[PDB]
Each structure stands twice: as structure tokens, then as C-alpha cells.
Amino acid sequence: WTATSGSCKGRCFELQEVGPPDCRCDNLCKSYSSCCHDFDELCLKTARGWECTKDRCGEVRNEENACHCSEDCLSRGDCCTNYQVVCKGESHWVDDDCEEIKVPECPAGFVRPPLIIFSVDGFRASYMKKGSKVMPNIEKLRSCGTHAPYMRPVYPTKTFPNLYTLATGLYPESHGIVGNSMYDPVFDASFHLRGREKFNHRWWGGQPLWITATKQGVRAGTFFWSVSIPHERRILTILQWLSLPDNERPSVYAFYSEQPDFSGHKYGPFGPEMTNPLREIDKTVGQLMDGLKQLRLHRCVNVIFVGDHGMEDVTCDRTEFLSNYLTNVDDITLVPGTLGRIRAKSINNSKYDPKTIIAALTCKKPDQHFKPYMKQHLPKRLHYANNRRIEDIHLLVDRRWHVARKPLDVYKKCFFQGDHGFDNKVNSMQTVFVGYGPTFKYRTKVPPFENIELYNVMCDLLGLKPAPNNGTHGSLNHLLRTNTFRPTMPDEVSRPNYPGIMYLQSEFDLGCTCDDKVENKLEELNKRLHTKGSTKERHLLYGRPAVLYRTSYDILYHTDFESGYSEIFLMPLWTSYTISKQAEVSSIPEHLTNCVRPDVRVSPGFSQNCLAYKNDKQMSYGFLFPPYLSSSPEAKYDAFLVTNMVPMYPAFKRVWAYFQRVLVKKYASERNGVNVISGPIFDYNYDGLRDTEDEIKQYVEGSSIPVPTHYYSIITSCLDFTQPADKCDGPLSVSSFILPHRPDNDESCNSSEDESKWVEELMKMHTARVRDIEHLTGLDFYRKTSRSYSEILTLKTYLHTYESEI
Ligand SMILES: *[C@@H]1O[C@H](CO)[C@@H](O[C@@H]2O[C@H](CO)[C@@H](O[C@@H]3O[C@H](CO[C@H]4O[C@H](CO)[C@@H](O)[C@H](O[C@H]5O[C@H](CO)[C@@H](O)[C@H](O)[C@@H]5O[C@H]5O[C@H](CO)[C@@H](O)[C@H](O)[C@@H]5O)[C@@H]4O)[C@@H](O)[C@H](O[C@H]4O[C@H](CO)[C@@H](O)[C@H](O)[C@@H]4O[C@H]4O[C@H](CO)[C@@H](O)[C@H](O)[C@@H]4O)[C@@H]3O)[C@H](O)[C@H]2NC(C)=O)[C@H](O)[C@H]1NC(C)=O
Ligand SMILES: Cc1cc(OCc2n[nH]c(=O)n2C(C)C)c(C(C)(C)C)cc1C#N
Ligand SMILES: [Ca+2]
Ligand SMILES: [Ca+2]
Ligand code: NA
Ligand code: NA
Ligand SMILES: [Zn+2]
Known part of the structure; x- marks a missing residue:
């Protein structure tokens, strides 16, 4: 209730909200139905319009007018905006040449x-x-x-x-305003564009x-x-x-x-x-x-x-209808349009099943114009999952399209020609x-x-x-x-260990095998150098990533790559390597197909084992530094170390293998060499932040080897591509991705085709900023470059979008 019989006299557009035993004269008053009786009369004057005219110049003040052209108006601060132009011979701001504003030129009493x-x-x-x-x-x-x-x-x-x-x-997931329309299941309340619930402060975080x-x-x-x-x-x-x-x-x-x-x-x-x-x-x-x-x-x-x-450009006729996909259309609630959000119509319905709805919506028609996702599977660059107001099932709608539940929602609810939300x-x-x-x-x-x-x-x-x-x-x-x-760079929290050779081969019982027992001070001193970091400057171009949380990890050096190997997650946090424009791709030799080699720098007890993969019928393994990019037959053996291995579903290995075998070399050719940093990500609670060890929901069967939710890569080269990535004197260029580690390729409707037809398209959809990877890993990259820290922050926020010219 509002006692609207107070007055807005001298109160028009007051800055303080009087909300309790009073009528209001601020902006919210209309929305609350609480304006004083005289609000329109006093505060929304329109008489004589918005512009001075010659005849009005130096007029006698008439307080009825929307704005003023009398001599007192400047000191009153209420002239029409064109007052000095019309009455005092001044120019419009737009007609003045621009002049650099080197310092603020402010009236007395302006503090800032x-x-x-x-x-x-x-x-x-x-x-x-x-x-x-x-x-x-x-x-x-x-x-x-x-x-x-x-x-x-x-x-x-x-x-x-x-x-x-x-x-x-x-991000919306953090502020709480995740759409123009929302249901919050804890409040049991709905936010809509029309109405008053949207003003309740509990929505706005x-x-x-x-x-x-x-x-x-x-x-x-x-x-x-x-x-x-x-x-x-x-x-x-x-x-x-x-x-x-x-x-x-x-x-x-x-x-x-x-x-x-x-x-x-x-x-x-x-x-x-x-x-x-x-x-x-x-x-x-x-x-x-x-x-x-x-x-x-x-x-x-x-x-x-x-x-x-x-x-x-969006019109009614470009609408996909869930009624053409689902038999149970009346058991769901859709938030429709340029995105779709689906939940059960009734929480008392126990034949509601997210898995069957997702499946009924997946690659069902040839030119299907939306793609369904469980929210945790959406591209991480969207940061659209960690909120109870975001429904588990999401539809990403193709540009120019809408989705709706059924046809009658579109004609009984063509008007429009434009929309947004994609x-x-x-x-x-x-x-x-x-x-x-x-x-x-x-x-x-x-x-x-x-x-x-x-x-x-x-x-x-x-x-x-x-x-x-x-x-x-x-x-x-x-x-x-x-x-x-x-800003200052964050401090490294964990310092690395630098292990030497500490274990004999027979101490390991990992059930791994390798045909590697094939036999020189020329080459032997050289390989000892490589294990000590002699090629580190080629492969670790921007300093080692800093680890910004407490953990136990080892730096491991190799001829062709450097890694930060976590004794806790039993795999690298990161693996860094450079591929010059001249590098050649080779295959995995026949005798090495199933080769995994114990790493005598790292204990059996902090190593993965091959038996766990043998027994896990769903899980296979991949490598972070690709054996295909080895610098020599002899260096290739390093790529099969158990410390370079990571758990990969067979379906994901299709993607990974094509990235490593084909795309890295393509990028090195295009960009004049690339530096690559790859690693795993664990975000089982989809908060965009690195998981602690006790949040991991899945392990390789019968082991303590954690299964990543995602794999990332950060691919850096010289912005001036006339210089090779490893001898770059100026600004850097980066592109990155965070690929979901999924046991199927259902996301990719053309995945039965050759990887050349779908893998890179998947990777583009999952493009990421370096900063996104930072949040997901607790790592801090580009710590040692010749660039200013602010320029590096700008590089870390870069997103390579693959959209053409704007
Ligand atoms: C983008 O930037 C933002 C901001 O920097 C990042 O968000 C922060 O992330 C932090 C980690 O997730 C998070 O810290 C938690 O805060 C808890 C206190 O939270 C309240 O107070 C703050 C301060 O004013 C307030 O901002 C919060 O507001 C949230 O919630 C309200 C109401 O729900 C919303 O209106 C608002 O929109 C916002 O919601 C968002 O965040 C929450 C999580 O906070 C999500 O649930 C929502 O989905 C939504 O996204 C709060 O009102 C504090 O309780 C937490 O502490 C727990 O964990 C620590 C471990 O360090 C431990 O000490 C404690 O034990 C404690 O655990 C206990 O509770 C557990 C969970 O219930 C339980 O399991 C345990 O057993 C324990 O009992 C924690 O510190 C911080 O709140 C948010 N801030 C914001 C504004 O969102 C975001 O991460 C960035 N994104 C990226 C990708 O980088
Ligand atoms: C620049 C700006 C405007 C704005 O709201 C403008 C507005 N006026 N009338 C109206 O309907 N709207 C929108 C449609 C709600 C807001 C809100 C958080 C209050 C939404 C924030 C910011 C910022 N920063
Ligand atoms: Ca808008
Ligand atoms: Ca997490
Ligand atoms: Na297996
Ligand atoms: Na597929
Ligand atoms: Zn709009």
C-alpha cells in the first residue's frame, strides 16, 4: 500500500529511495505503483517540447515548461540542451573539431x-x-x-x-541473472520480464x-x-x-x-x-x-x-519444434527461443528421464538447427552451468533459428524479424x-x-x-x-621437485611392456644433457607455468618436451613442446604400438599402471606429447614414458590423435612454428574451477588414476609470423581449446566421417581463453616473456573465435 497523497514538490527524481510510509518520486515509483499524486505534473513536464527556439531566448521563466530558455536557466541547471546554440551563438558539440583531452578540464569542486x-x-x-x-x-x-x-x-x-x-x-552463472526468464527451485519462484518478482533483491547477486x-x-x-x-x-x-x-x-x-x-x-x-x-x-x-x-x-x-x-535475422518460420522429436512433449517445460532450457513439468514425475530426452534430441534430422547438451558439456567459454537456475538440459540454437515446444506456441501466444540470445x-x-x-x-x-x-x-x-x-x-x-x-603476477605456491634417476626398472610392476631393450659416449653424454634440461629453452618458451595451489609435483625434462608431473593426479598438469615450421610428422613404429615405459625418475607408487587400462573396458590411454612429432627415432622412446600417459576414452582418442598427428603440424606450418602446452582438466562440479582431489567422480577402474573431464591446449606463436615461434622478439599470438573428454562423439553429428570432416569443427566450438584454462588448472602461464604484464593479461583474455570479418 502507498499513501500517494504526499507531494513530489522539490523531490523530482530524488536519489534516495523513500520506501516505507511515503510516496516516491524516484524512477522506481512507476514500477512499484507508488508515485506521488503530482509526479507526472511536476516531474514529467513536456510543455513546449525539448528544444529552444529563437523566440524563446531570454523568455521569462515559466515553471510549466519541459525545459528552459530564460537567462536564469544555466545557474538553475535546467536549460534545453540546445540553449547556448540557439540563444548564445554557440556550436553543437558535434560540429567542433576534436581536440585531444590531455588532462581533465573540470569546474571547481569536481573531485574527479x-x-x-x-x-x-x-x-x-x-x-x-x-x-x-x-x-x-x-x-x-x-x-x-x-x-x-x-x-x-x-x-x-x-x-x-x-x-x-x-x-x-x-558471468551470469555467478550474478544469478541467467536469462530474461528464470525458475529458481530453492525459492520455488519465477523471474519474468513483466511483473514485480524481478525487483526482489534475492535474484540479483x-x-x-x-x-x-x-x-x-x-x-x-x-x-x-x-x-x-x-x-x-x-x-x-x-x-x-x-x-x-x-x-x-x-x-x-x-x-x-x-x-x-x-x-x-x-x-x-x-x-x-x-x-x-x-x-x-x-x-x-x-x-x-x-x-x-x-x-x-x-x-x-x-x-x-x-x-x-x-x-x-530470425523469423517464425525458422522454428524447430520439440513436438517433432519427443513423444512425451507434455511432460517437459521449455524456456524457448534463441536458446532452450528444459526441465520436468512435474517434480512428482519419476518416469522423467534426462537421458532419453537428450537422446531423442540428438542428430535426429539432417539439417537440425539446435544441439542438445547436458549443461556441464556446453563449451567452457560460455561459463553457463554453475547455477541452480540453469536447467540441466540446454539447447544451443543455430543463429537465425528458434526452438519452441510445439507449433501452437508460435502462432497462438508472423510478427518479428530479429532476435538475439545465441x-x-x-x-x-x-x-x-x-x-x-x-x-x-x-x-x-x-x-x-x-x-x-x-x-x-x-x-x-x-x-x-x-x-x-x-x-x-x-x-x-x-x-x-x-x-x-x-597488477603483480601471483606468487607461485608450490615449488617443483627436480628428480634424477632414482629407480631401477625391476622395481616397477605396472604390467606395461615395451620393445625398447635395443642398444657410446658421443650420444650418451648428449641424452644425459637432455634429461637435465639442455633443450628446455626450445620447448619452454615463456617460463614454466606457476602452480598456484599446494601440491606435490616434479619437473621432467626430455629432448622434445618438458612436463610438470603431479604425484597426486599421477599425470602431468602440463606438458610443453615446440614444433618448428620445418618439423616432420612420423608414425608410431610397429614394434612400439603398445609400448609404455617406466620412468626411472618417478616411483612405482606415483606412476600409472597398464593393468588398470587393460581391465577398464571403457578406458584407453593417450599421450600428452605426441609420439608422431618426435625429433628422432631415439627421442621417440621418451614419448612412451608412463609419465606422459593420460586416460582417454577411445572415442576421444579419435579427436586427440587427429589434433596431434595432423593439426599441430598444420598450425606450425601456418604460424611459422608453434609452442604447445597441453594437459588435463578436472571440473566435475562444473564451477569453472580446478577440482581438488576429493571432488573427482571417476577413476580408471580399480585404480587411483583420475579421469579428466577435459583436455586443453594452449598454442602460442609470434604475432609477426615472419619470425619463428622460438625466436620471437615482439608480441605473441595465441589460440587455445578446452575439449570435453567424452566417451562418445554424439556432439559431432558427422563423426562417422573421417576426422578431417568434423574434428577441427569440434575444436573451434571449444575454443577458450588462456585465462579459462588458468581457472580450471590453478596454473599461471607466460611468467617469463619480454612483454609487459598488462599486455600478457590481454593475451590471456584473448579468444580465437574463427568467425570471419565483422
Ligand atoms: C567469477 O568471479 C566470482 C567472484 O569472485 C567467483 O565466485 C566466487 O567463487 C567462490 C568459490 O566458488 C565463492 O566462495 C564461496 O563463498 C561462500 C559464501 O558465499 C556467500 O557470500 C558471498 C560474499 O558476499 C556472496 O557473493 C555469495 O553469493 C552467491 O550466492 C548467493 C545466494 O545463493 C547469490 O545471490 C549469488 O548470485 C552468488 O551465487 C553464486 O555463487 C554460489 C557459491 O558461492 C553458487 O552456489 C551459485 O551457483 C552462484 O554461482 C554467497 O551469498 C562460502 O560459504 C564458501 O566456502 C565453502 O568452501 C570453503 C573452501 O575454501 C570452506 O572454507 C568452507 O568449508 C565452505 O564450505 C562449506 O559449505 C560447503 C557448500 O555448501 C559444504 O560442502 C562444506 O561441507 C562446508 O559446510 C566459498 O568461499 C564465492 O561466493 C563466489 N562469489 C560470487 C559472487 O559468486 C567465480 O568463481 C568466478 N568464476 C570463474 C570461472 O573464475
Ligand atoms: C547501464 C545499465 C542499465 C541497467 O538498466 C537499464 C534499464 N532502464 N530501464 C529498463 O527497463 N532497463 C533494463 C532493460 C532493465 C542496468 C540494470 C542492472 C538495472 C538492469 C545496469 C546497467 C549497467 N551497468
Ligand atoms: Ca537487450
Ligand atoms: Ca571444479
Ligand atoms: Na581399456
Ligand atoms: Na557422432
Ligand atoms: Zn531484444
Whole structure:
């Protein structure tokens, strides 16, 4: 209940929420049905529109007007934004040449440059170039400030998850806003776009920027604007807040526009009708910048122009229906559209079975436009599993398509031509970033980066300490003129052991065999050197990875590769090798097909054994350093050491073998040599973080050999590919993957075909950032390079997307 008989007199767009025995005059009031009786009259004036005209100049103040053109308006802080242009002969901000902003030029009493976040819904990255002719204000922000060719949103590429990710620096699985629609089974409650449950604070996790600011003494304007408040009034409200006295004035502000998303849904991303919404958004920018210029703030405020996601062509006729796949369609609840989420309709239904639904949905029609996954099997780069509000069964929908439960949901619920929500690496889902102001660089283009990184930067811009988040703080230092954040490398927690030869062959009883008893100070001194690390500089190019948790492990050196061998998991944590452009691929000789060799540096008790694989009817083994890439017949024996072996399902070995035999050499040819670091990952609770030894759910039968959930590889070379990977003088180039270790290839519908037709496609789907591997392994890579630490942080956040040109 609201006693709506209080008044908004002098309270319009008040910053403090009065929620208890009072009517409200803030932005949330409409949404709560709690506005004072006179809120529209006082706070949403529209009389005479938004622009001064010559005849209005020096008018007598009329408090009824939406905005003012009288002489007192500047000191009142409520002129129309074009006031100085129309009445005082000034130019529009857009018409002024750009001039570098080398230092902030702020009015007295400003303690710091304010930050304004200007967020636009559904603003697809290519609009910056494609719509440039009709967006002169945005074009000036972009060309004069710092811009990326595009910014990668989070999955799902929906509004609420992306705007809250911008505000928190967190993945959706961590902030809790995992969709525009959600069911939370612990609360037994539903979150929807319409209605009031979405305002309950229990949905919204982490710490958003306005709370971070407030806790550290920095005031914030509203981030939420009621849909019915016209954009011109939103801008006037920000500009009025900027004229408050110092002790009351906020330092951080957000504007939000529902456009171009709103029209894009109706017309598609490039519908002829889209030109007008782009023009209108540019006009709003122009109003803001004109307004800042009037207040003498246009060379003091940092402005971020930023989207939440793009927009793709999607129409009703491109809908797959679960009713064409499942017999039991009425026993499920689908969250539909550009992603699908499935759970049981009734928790009292015990003939509900995830396994049969997944199977009924797997490769059932030739050009099937969605792929079903148990959430823990989704590409790890999505980070979309560790939340009870994410249903176990997920459908990844192909771009340009929808999924729905049955046909009647599509016509009895074609309207639309655009939609979004797809995999966040899809080119049409990419959105925009421009930063303009004293703290941003001048005329600078930066590479594409992910929106999870911006929270840290916004905290930098405001002198705030960010709450713990998923950005990598310092990875976006190259956007900034000043206020950089100078991170230090984390300290190594575990130091390695460096074992020498300590065991005789007969101490091992691993049930392994090798035809290796085939017989020189020339070559013998040389092989002793290799085991001591004499080739280590060739194979370990960026220093050894640091182990950032407590564990027991050994560095093992070989002619062709170096490894960090875990005495706890009985296998390497990492294996590092370089393959030059000139390297040759060879086969596994016939006599070595089943060869596994004890490693006399590592005890029987810390070794895998071959009998466990013999007895495990489902499990085979692979090697981390590939025997196919051995530098000589004699070096090849090292590849069969029991310390290079890892458990692999036969189905996964198809993928692994093709990577090692064919792809590594292809990459070395293309990139002028590559350095490769491969290893296992254990994430049985799908939290994106390295498992402890007591979280491992599966072992090779009858043993203590843990089964990885994933295998990764990090493939590094010289950005200037005229230099070979092992003699690179400047910046690095990287691509990486985290392949799921699955007992079938059901994910790959063409897997009965030759690996050349499906393996690399699988690996592209599972592309990853080095940082993702860091979280999953507790390792820290690239510790010894000639590059600055911030540049290395940027490299660690790189994702190789395999999408073509934006
Ligand atoms: C992305 O960045 C983020 C942030 O840095 C990373 O997330 C952090 O990861 C930590 C490890 O998973 C996690 O630490 C745990 O915190 C527990 C206390 O949690 C509460 O308090 C914090 C602080 O304010 C708050 O942020 C939390 O908010 C979560 O939960 C609420 C309500 O559910 C949500 O509103 C919110 O969205 C958020 O949910 C997310 O996280 C939780 C896990 O915290 C998930 O369940 C959700 O799915 C969702 O993703 C909380 O309100 C603390 O209790 C934990 O301590 C346990 O483990 C340690 C081992 O060190 C041990 O000392 C204790 O024994 C304890 O174990 C006991 O409980 C166990 C489990 O019940 C039980 O098995 C034992 O037997 C014991 O009794 C732990 O420290 C931290 O909370 C989150 N923070 C956030 C914001 O998510 C994220 O990892 C990054 N992602 C990647 C890929 O790097
Ligand atoms: C820039 C920004 C805007 C924003 O909300 C803008 C908004 N105004 N009106 C409206 O309906 N919306 C969205 C659609 C909910 C939010 C929320 C977390 C509050 C969603 C965060 C951030 C950030 N960072
Ligand atoms: Ca949106
Ligand atoms: Ca884990
Ligand atoms: Na086996
Ligand atoms: Na298959
Ligand atoms: Zn939309």
C-alpha cells in the first residue's frame, strides 16, 4: 500500500529511495505503483517540447515548461540542451573539431571526472560502420576517443544478463541473472520480464557498480529508467544532477535506451526502418554532449557508449519444434527461443528421464538447427552451468533459428524479424564499445574484448576498488591514458621437485611392456644433457607455468618436451613442446604400438599402471606429447614414458590423435612454428574451477588414476609470423581449446566421417581463453616473456573465435 497523497514538490527524481510510509518520486515509483499524486505534473513536464527556439531566448521563466530558455536557466541547471546554440551563438558539440583531452578540464569542486554510461539495447557492432552516415555524434565519440571494432557480450546474449554483467563484472552463472526468464527451485519462484518478482533483491547477486561506489563514498545516479520516461527527460535529469552542489552530486550516471533493440525485433537488424532509430539515438547523444558542453563538462566527463548484445535475422518460420522429436512433449517445460532450457513439468514425475530426452534430441534430422547438451558439456567459454537456475538440459540454437515446444506456441501466444540470445561468439551478437574522455586514449583503436572486463575499468575510472569479479584486472589498461591498475603476477605456491634417476626398472610392476631393450659416449653424454634440461629453452618458451595451489609435483625434462608431473593426479598438469615450421610428422613404429615405459625418475607408487587400462573396458590411454612429432627415432622412446600417459576414452582418442598427428603440424606450418602446452582438466562440479582431489567422480577402474573431464591446449606463436615461434622478439599470438573428454562423439553429428570432416569443427566450438584454462588448472602461464604484464593479461583474455570479418 502507498499513501500517494504526499507531494513530489522539490523531490523530482530524488536519489534516495523513500520506501516505507511515503510516496516516491524516484524512477522506481512507476514500477512499484507508488508515485506521488503530482509526479507526472511536476516531474514529467513536456510543455513546449525539448528544444529552444529563437523566440524563446531570454523568455521569462515559466515553471510549466519541459525545459528552459530564460537567462536564469544555466545557474538553475535546467536549460534545453540546445540553449547556448540557439540563444548564445554557440556550436553543437558535434560540429567542433576534436581536440585531444590531455588532462581533465573540470569546474571547481569536481573531485574527479564523472563517468556516464550510455547504454543502448540491441546495438549490433556493425552499426558503427554501417550506420556511420546517420550517426555523426556517435561517429565523433568513436573516431576521437578509444573504440573497439566490437565488444563480446556474455551468453545468453539477452538484455538482463548482459546489463547486469556490465554492472558486476560477473558471468551470469555467478550474478544469478541467467536469462530474461528464470525458475529458481530453492525459492520455488519465477523471474519474468513483466511483473514485480524481478525487483526482489534475492535474484540479483554480486555487487553492482552503484553499490561498489556507494560503499566507498562515491554517489550514484539511477541505473534503471522507467520505460515511459522519454529519453529527452532522462538526459535532462542527468544534467540536472550534474548541477547539484558537490556534496550531493553523483559521480557515476547511466542512461539506457530501449532502441535500437525494440525496432530490430520488428524489422530485423538491417531493415530499412532501422535508419530512424539510429538517427534518434544519435540525436540523444548530441543532446547529452551539448548539455555537457553548456555545463563546461565536455572535457571533464568520461563517457562510455556501450551495447548489451547485437541482433540477428530470425523469423517464425525458422522454428524447430520439440513436438517433432519427443513423444512425451507434455511432460517437459521449455524456456524457448534463441536458446532452450528444459526441465520436468512435474517434480512428482519419476518416469522423467534426462537421458532419453537428450537422446531423442540428438542428430535426429539432417539439417537440425539446435544441439542438445547436458549443461556441464556446453563449451567452457560460455561459463553457463554453475547455477541452480540453469536447467540441466540446454539447447544451443543455430543463429537465425528458434526452438519452441510445439507449433501452437508460435502462432497462438508472423510478427518479428530479429532476435538475439545465441552463442556469444556469433558475429551478429557482437555489440559496441567506445570510451571518450580525459581518462581514455585519444583516436585509439583497441582489439575486441569481453564485457566482463568493463566493471574493473569503471571502478578504475572512479578510483574504486572492484569487488571480486571475472574480469582480469589490467587486461584493459591499454584503453586508458591514466588510472591504470598495475597488477603483480601471483606468487607461485608450490615449488617443483627436480628428480634424477632414482629407480631401477625391476622395481616397477605396472604390467606395461615395451620393445625398447635395443642398444657410446658421443650420444650418451648428449641424452644425459637432455634429461637435465639442455633443450628446455626450445620447448619452454615463456617460463614454466606457476602452480598456484599446494601440491606435490616434479619437473621432467626430455629432448622434445618438458612436463610438470603431479604425484597426486599421477599425470602431468602440463606438458610443453615446440614444433618448428620445418618439423616432420612420423608414425608410431610397429614394434612400439603398445609400448609404455617406466620412468626411472618417478616411483612405482606415483606412476600409472597398464593393468588398470587393460581391465577398464571403457578406458584407453593417450599421450600428452605426441609420439608422431618426435625429433628422432631415439627421442621417440621418451614419448612412451608412463609419465606422459593420460586416460582417454577411445572415442576421444579419435579427436586427440587427429589434433596431434595432423593439426599441430598444420598450425606450425601456418604460424611459422608453434609452442604447445597441453594437459588435463578436472571440473566435475562444473564451477569453472580446478577440482581438488576429493571432488573427482571417476577413476580408471580399480585404480587411483583420475579421469579428466577435459583436455586443453594452449598454442602460442609470434604475432609477426615472419619470425619463428622460438625466436620471437615482439608480441605473441595465441589460440587455445578446452575439449570435453567424452566417451562418445554424439556432439559431432558427422563423426562417422573421417576426422578431417568434423574434428577441427569440434575444436573451434571449444575454443577458450588462456585465462579459462588458468581457472580450471590453478596454473599461471607466460611468467617469463619480454612483454609487459598488462599486455600478457590481454593475451590471456584473448579468444580465437574463427568467425570471419565483422
Ligand atoms: C567469477 O568471479 C566470482 C567472484 O569472485 C567467483 O565466485 C566466487 O567463487 C567462490 C568459490 O566458488 C565463492 O566462495 C564461496 O563463498 C561462500 C559464501 O558465499 C556467500 O557470500 C558471498 C560474499 O558476499 C556472496 O557473493 C555469495 O553469493 C552467491 O550466492 C548467493 C545466494 O545463493 C547469490 O545471490 C549469488 O548470485 C552468488 O551465487 C553464486 O555463487 C554460489 C557459491 O558461492 C553458487 O552456489 C551459485 O551457483 C552462484 O554461482 C554467497 O551469498 C562460502 O560459504 C564458501 O566456502 C565453502 O568452501 C570453503 C573452501 O575454501 C570452506 O572454507 C568452507 O568449508 C565452505 O564450505 C562449506 O559449505 C560447503 C557448500 O555448501 C559444504 O560442502 C562444506 O561441507 C562446508 O559446510 C566459498 O568461499 C564465492 O561466493 C563466489 N562469489 C560470487 C559472487 O559468486 C567465480 O568463481 C568466478 N568464476 C570463474 C570461472 O573464475
Ligand atoms: C547501464 C545499465 C542499465 C541497467 O538498466 C537499464 C534499464 N532502464 N530501464 C529498463 O527497463 N532497463 C533494463 C532493460 C532493465 C542496468 C540494470 C542492472 C538495472 C538492469 C545496469 C546497467 C549497467 N551497468
Ligand atoms: Ca537487450
Ligand atoms: Ca571444479
Ligand atoms: Na581399456
Ligand atoms: Na557422432
Ligand atoms: Zn531484444
